[PDB]
Amino acid sequence: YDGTKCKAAGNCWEPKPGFPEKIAGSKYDPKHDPKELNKQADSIKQMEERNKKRVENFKKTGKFEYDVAKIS
Amino acid sequence: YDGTKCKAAGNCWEPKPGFPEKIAGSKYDPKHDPKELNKQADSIKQMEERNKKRVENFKKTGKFEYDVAKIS
Amino acid sequence: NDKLVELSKSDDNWVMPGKNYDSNNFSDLKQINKGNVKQLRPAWTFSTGLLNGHEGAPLVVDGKMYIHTSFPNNTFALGLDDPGTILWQDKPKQNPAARAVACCDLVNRGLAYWPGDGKTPALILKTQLDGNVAALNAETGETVWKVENSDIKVGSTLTIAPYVVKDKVIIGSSGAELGVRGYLTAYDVKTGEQVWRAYATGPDKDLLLASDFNIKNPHYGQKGLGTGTWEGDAWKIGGGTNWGWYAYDPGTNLIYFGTGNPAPWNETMRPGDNKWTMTIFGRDADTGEAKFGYQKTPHDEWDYAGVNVMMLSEQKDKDGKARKLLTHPDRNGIVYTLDRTDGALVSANKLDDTVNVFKSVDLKTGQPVRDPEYGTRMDHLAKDICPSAMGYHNQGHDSYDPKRELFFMGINHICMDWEPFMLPYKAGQFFVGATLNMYPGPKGDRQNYEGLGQIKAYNAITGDYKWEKMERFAVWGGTMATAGDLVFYGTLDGYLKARDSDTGDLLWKFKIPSGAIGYPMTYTHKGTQYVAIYYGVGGWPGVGLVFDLADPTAGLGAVGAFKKLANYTQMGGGVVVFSLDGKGPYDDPNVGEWKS
Amino acid sequence: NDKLVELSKSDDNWVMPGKNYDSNNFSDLKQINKGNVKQLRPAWTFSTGLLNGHEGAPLVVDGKMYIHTSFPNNTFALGLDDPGTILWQDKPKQNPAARAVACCDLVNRGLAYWPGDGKTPALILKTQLDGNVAALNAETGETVWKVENSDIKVGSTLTIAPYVVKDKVIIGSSGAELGVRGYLTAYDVKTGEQVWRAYATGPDKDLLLASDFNIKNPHYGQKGLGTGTWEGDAWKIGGGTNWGWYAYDPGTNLIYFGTGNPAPWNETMRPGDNKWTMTIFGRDADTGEAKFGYQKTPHDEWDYAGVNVMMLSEQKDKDGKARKLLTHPDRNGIVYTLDRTDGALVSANKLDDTVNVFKSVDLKTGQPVRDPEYGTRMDHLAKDICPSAMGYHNQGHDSYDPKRELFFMGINHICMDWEPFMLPYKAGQFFVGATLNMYPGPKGDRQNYEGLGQIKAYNAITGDYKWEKMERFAVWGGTMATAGDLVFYGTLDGYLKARDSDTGDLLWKFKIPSGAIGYPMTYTHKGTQYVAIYYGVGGWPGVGLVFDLADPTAGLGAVGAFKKLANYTQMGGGVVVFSLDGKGPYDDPNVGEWK
Numbered sequence A, B: 001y002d003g004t005k006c007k008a009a010g011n012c013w014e015p016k017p018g019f020p021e022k023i024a025g026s027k028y029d030p031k032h033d034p035k036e037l038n039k040q041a042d043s044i045k046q047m048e049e050r051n052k053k054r055v056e057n058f059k060k061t062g063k064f065e066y067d068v069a070k071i072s
Numbered sequence C: 001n002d003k004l005v006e007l008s009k010s011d012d013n014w015v016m017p018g019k020n021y022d023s024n025n026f027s028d029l030k031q032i033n034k035g036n037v038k039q040l041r042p043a044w045t046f047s048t049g050l051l052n053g054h055e056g057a058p059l060v061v062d063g064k065m066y067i068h069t070s071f072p073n074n075t076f077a078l079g080l081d082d083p084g085t086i087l088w089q090d091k092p093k094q095n096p097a098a099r100a101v102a103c104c105d106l107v108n109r110g111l112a113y114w115p116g117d118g119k120t121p122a123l124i125l126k127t128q129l130d131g132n133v134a135a136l137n138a139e140t141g142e143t144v145w146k147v148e149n150s151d152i153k154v155g156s157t158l159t160i161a162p163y164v165v166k167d168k169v170i171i172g173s174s175g176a177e178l179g180v181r182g183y184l185t186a187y188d189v190k191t192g193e194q195v196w197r198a199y200a201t202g203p204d205k206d207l208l209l210a211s212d213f214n215i216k217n218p219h220y221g222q223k224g225l226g227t228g229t230w231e232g233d234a235w236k237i238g239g240g241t242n243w244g245w246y247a248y249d250p251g252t253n254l255i256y257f258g259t260g261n262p263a264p265w266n267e268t269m270r271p272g273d274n275k276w277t278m279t280i281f282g283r284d285a286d287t288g289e290a291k292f293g294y295q296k297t298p299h300d301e302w303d304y305a306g307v308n309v310m311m312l313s314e315q316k317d318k319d320g321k322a323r324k325l326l327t328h329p330d331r332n333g334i335v336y337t338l339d340r341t342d343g344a345l346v347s348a349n350k351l352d353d354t355v356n357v358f359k360s361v362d363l364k365t366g367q368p369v370r371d372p373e374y375g376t377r378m379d380h381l382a383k384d385i386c387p388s389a390m391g392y393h394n395q396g397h398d399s400y401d402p403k404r405e406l407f408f409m410g411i412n413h414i415c416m417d418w419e420p421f422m423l424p425y426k427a428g429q430f431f432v433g434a435t436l437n438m439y440p441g442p443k444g445d446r447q448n449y450e451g452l453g454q455i456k457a458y459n460a461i462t463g464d465y466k467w468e469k470m471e472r473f474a475v476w477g478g479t480m481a482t483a484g485d486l487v488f489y490g491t492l493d494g495y496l497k498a499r500d501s502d503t504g505d506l507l508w509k510f511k512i513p514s515g516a517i518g519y520p521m522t523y524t525h526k527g528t529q530y531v532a533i534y535y536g537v538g539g540w541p542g543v544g545l546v547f548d549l550a551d552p553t554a555g556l557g558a559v560g561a562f563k564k565l566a567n568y569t570q571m572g573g574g575v576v577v578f579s580l581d582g583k584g585p586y587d588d589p590n591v592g593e594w595k596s
Numbered sequence D: 001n002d003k004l005v006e007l008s009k010s011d012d013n014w015v016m017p018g019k020n021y022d023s024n025n026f027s028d029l030k031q032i033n034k035g036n037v038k039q040l041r042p043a044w045t046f047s048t049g050l051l052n053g054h055e056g057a058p059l060v061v062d063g064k065m066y067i068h069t070s071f072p073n074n075t076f077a078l079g080l081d082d083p084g085t086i087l088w089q090d091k092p093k094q095n096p097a098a099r100a101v102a103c104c105d106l107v108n109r110g111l112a113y114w115p116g117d118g119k120t121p122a123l124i125l126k127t128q129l130d131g132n133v134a135a136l137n138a139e140t141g142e143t144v145w146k147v148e149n150s151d152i153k154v155g156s157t158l159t160i161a162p163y164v165v166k167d168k169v170i171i172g173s174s175g176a177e178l179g180v181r182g183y184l185t186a187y188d189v190k191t192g193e194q195v196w197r198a199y200a201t202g203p204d205k206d207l208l209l210a211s212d213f214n215i216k217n218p219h220y221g222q223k224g225l226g227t228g229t230w231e232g233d234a235w236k237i238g239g240g241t242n243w244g245w246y247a248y249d250p251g252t253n254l255i256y257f258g259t260g261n262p263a264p265w266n267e268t269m270r271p272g273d274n275k276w277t278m279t280i281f282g283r284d285a286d287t288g289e290a291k292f293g294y295q296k297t298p299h300d301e302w303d304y305a306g307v308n309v310m311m312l313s314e315q316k317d318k319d320g321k322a323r324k325l326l327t328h329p330d331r332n333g334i335v336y337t338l339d340r341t342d343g344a345l346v347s348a349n350k351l352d353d354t355v356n357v358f359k360s361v362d363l364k365t366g367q368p369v370r371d372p373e374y375g376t377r378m379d380h381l382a383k384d385i386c387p388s389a390m391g392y393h394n395q396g397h398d399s400y401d402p403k404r405e406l407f408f409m410g411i412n413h414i415c416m417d418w419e420p421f422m423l424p425y426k427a428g429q430f431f432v433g434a435t436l437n438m439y440p441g442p443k444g445d446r447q448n449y450e451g452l453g454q455i456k457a458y459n460a461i462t463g464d465y466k467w468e469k470m471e472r473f474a475v476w477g478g479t480m481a482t483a484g485d486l487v488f489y490g491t492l493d494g495y496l497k498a499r500d501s502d503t504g505d506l507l508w509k510f511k512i513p514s515g516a517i518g519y520p521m522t523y524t525h526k527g528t529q530y531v532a533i534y535y536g537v538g539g540w541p542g543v544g545l546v547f548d549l550a551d552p553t554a555g556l557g558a559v560g561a562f563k564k565l566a567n568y569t570q571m572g573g574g575v576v577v578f579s580l581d582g583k584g585p586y587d588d589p590n591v592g593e594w595k
């Protein structure tokens, strides 16, 4: 692997000598939990919803409130 | 009580108007626990005995040791 | 922003990170010059009340200085005729658990300014370690709006400075050492409403590509590669956070910046080129859409995070033609120069001849030619790799002199040993997976652990270095240059220094209270020129001193490399301000006293 | 110590707290003077790595500077030809619980030095907040000996500087706000052995009195009063700790110093004169035996702790006879001058005309004449008492010019309201028993909370003030004077200042990073004169800022009085060094670089 063999535009990766093309099923398989992989995108969706409630209350009332529990 | 009436040299205290000459038995009695009063003198005796073990071992050996459990 | 351009033309002001939208850190002032710099001495000082590292530099606008700190991220406003009186202060309340998910000390790179319009007053913009972004009234310090950008419960924090363009503020991201997938965001500067958000990995809809992305250099790659150069769903925790600096050209409408390292550090766990981590981007300021993207380090094996400074210029190329350019010194040991209108490669040269990870960069294919003897992999201990993970360049903001056509660069001389290990991903926990040993490179003193830095003067078209000088420690905080034939910079052992711009000769230094990890700035006030710098050592080089660590592999391997730093400096936090013969606001000492 | 006397005669050294055994803080140097001080500017700086208050001043001996810090009490040694290299450091390990029984911030007042004898090497002597005392090798920093003086489990800590006399080191005490009975101790400087220990209250055997104690002034009191001026066993928890400064005269062999306040602050819980709290002592350096003792404040009602600076001089009295003297400005609003050979009272005058707690001091009987309208007692709220418990003078070390016969004093202008309350004693817990409100005195601005300080020039025999000047905040850290006609001092709002010795006119100032609560010092190195000062605000005036407090009755009442201090300064820790034109060790910038 010297970086100069490219099967397509922007795609030049090769395995090193003795290593596999795909790691699934090998002794290098990471076995990630899908429920852990999805936690940071669900957290961003919830921040975005709390921010929309803050910004729409500012533009109706003219007074900013950060604490969502105190917004009508 | 203005500090100028002295019953002996260096002893000029007087009670203020309406206050007693002695506070034991009065509504100002502090009611101190004799066992709590004696705690700081017991602590000073224990520090002085640990320091003597450290100093005599330094003078005999020429090497200072602070942990008295390591001094025979 | 048109009024920020106009304000940057006055020498009484310093209005944005990097001085101006070209990001050159260059002043036309010459009251202080090579003929009189020996007379420079302190005029006044100010302590921030905090320890840990003090990064970035102050702002100056309309007769006032604005100062920022380490965690919990306080802000102070001072009047230049009487800096002993504090005009206002902002002191945030934050969860102490934010400290436990910071990789690299409790640092912050600084403030931005929006000049106001016709009903909204002028604003100071700031980030906080806990992931909030706030706008403050510049005259009173009161909060106008505050929103949540990043979540500490999944390992995501903020250390970058905000950047103002037109009526928007741009916000980056931190946490690749904890498996955070990078994104940058534009907000409406008047209200906090989210306008656009672009990710560094994943499906094309999330990347925000223009319909003509990379049309002039299609061999760089085009559609489908944010999932096509990964196995399965590994891109979801894949890194690419952007925590460095920006530049802007009103004539192209593009912002210029780099994305960080893929996660984890164990390369064997993520086969593929891992796009679009490690990439130089040009994105539209109003929509976020990418016009071009160049990947400098395909399939990273070394933590060469691609976030460093962007400096703009206009120069004739080797065939005599006038070009509009960007110049960028990377962690990986290469300094890159590109055409900033379409992304074309102009030059890619080594920062020092001891770089061994690549043999060269091919200008016609765009790929770096790898030396397999200096790569990393499972079940192998790799030795003597240059550069180390700390880089031959890190977060310092450098400078450019447009009369001389030279870049002045603060450089690191640090190499390494590395072995990876297998580990699970758990949201909120570290996700690194490698053990390191770090030490001085071949031109320093490896046996004594000294000789870890350099400062150099560089031409980007010919590739020639006009002069080169060795330093005791890495030059970590950047540089500032002036029309007085001077280059200024701070050091980790605790000095402000000045060198001759044409030869590199050391003309002057002063012993400040603690090491410096930010850049110098300069301004005039009522006719007198001043030079200011923060003191307070920290960031990655300072972790052994700051956290009382002694295992040399601790601190991601920085503790062994900087074992002698504590013999030369201790922690601190504040600003020192200099002038000729120390002239200042208290030359009449009755100014600012209490009177009855 | 005869070798310390000789080393102090060189202008290249500063070898003890207060410069010399007279404790005058006075330099014969005149390179820096009233004609050129506008040229004074920084030469080099050093951060300590710590926040909280930085009290005292550095030592200079044999081409080296020695620096000390707030808790956990670190020590640094620097070479004057290259101060960017740290020669050695000492970093103690201490129980974090020591912080919770400190009354008044995590401060320390500094180091002492003993010059060696050919067998034992020269030594640096230090105290720690946790109650240990240590001797360090001056060349290498290694520990030679370490002993326990004070116990945090009963409320007892250390903040005082050690003091070296002959081949002995003298160590004081802290904790009267927690009911600690005061004592001072002498140790053999070579080994750590305890030689003598003297208590402030109790039976005569524990007081360590000479057989002829007060024979020249028997009306001051003599035998049996350490128990006879108390009811029952209340003297066992009675206060009198000594945490300020000393002076010494080789010709009398006496050390001079003051004992602090009685416990608790509630006066109704301790009837009697409460001897020997609040007392000026003269004790023999080798045996500790007291020759004389004068009680300034019998039966304290105000927390006027009697620990302040001692300054020696030799002057003609009003009848024209030559006298050997001590002069001492107290918390209670009175400045005292005594004969230092026999204890006789010479003068006792007000620090400012606004003092109202006493009408006068009677020089024939020695008793202060009390005004009962400004006393304290149970079931009563007392208002507008001057001075406050913070004093018209606190812990700052002042100076004396021997040719002008003038004392230069840093003063406080703070008054109060006070009411006591009943409470029990439990060892290890606070034992105060009063609630306070504090504010500027009548010559300041009581509604903006500014005008809290003064600096004055004084003659001890006539009682006349040559000049007087107001300051924004209390002048907390002391003063230093020179033969260049200048008086130097630091301020809480963050300056080093210089005033003219004859008129008080302000000639120069510099904005340092944080407020100053220690004294300035001066020395020569290879022909150049330097002036140095610590920065880092704290101590009692800084508790609001240091601990983030807002209730005005908190910090024992100090939070309300200093509510505007945070508008002028923030915390810090370090040293700034000045010279003419900023000349220094890096004038060749290649010195100290890597090669």
Ligand SMILES: O=C(O)c1cc(C(=O)O)c2c(n1)C(=O)C(=O)c1cc(C(=O)O)[nH]c1-2
Pocket: C055, C103, C104, C107, C158, C159, C160, C173, C174, C175, C176, C177, C241, C243, C260, C261, C303, C305, C389, C390, C394, C395, C538, C539, C540, C541
């Ligand atoms: O990957 C990331 O998200 C991330 C964030 C930070 C940061 O936010 O300060 C640093 C790092 N990486 C890193 O690779 C690095 O070398 C580094 C040095 C420092 C500094 O302030 O000295 N920060 C960071």
Ligand SMILES: O=C(O)c1cc(C(=O)O)c2c(n1)C(=O)C(=O)c1cc(C(=O)O)[nH]c1-2
Pocket: D103, D104, D105, D107, D158, D159, D160, D173, D174, D175, D176, D177, D241, D243, D260, D261, D305, D389, D390, D394, D395, D538, D539, D540, D541
């Ligand atoms: O009663 C005592 O034992 C004791 C100790 C201390 C100290 O150790 O600093 C102070 C006080 N009292 C106190 O009364 C006081 O006004 C005070 C001010 C300061 C300071 O450093 O600013 N320390 C102390």
Ligand SMILES: [Ca+2]
Pocket: C176, C177, C260, C261, C305
């Ligand atoms: Ca990183």
Ligand SMILES: [Ca+2]
Pocket: D176, D177, D260, D261, D305
């Ligand atoms: Ca006290």
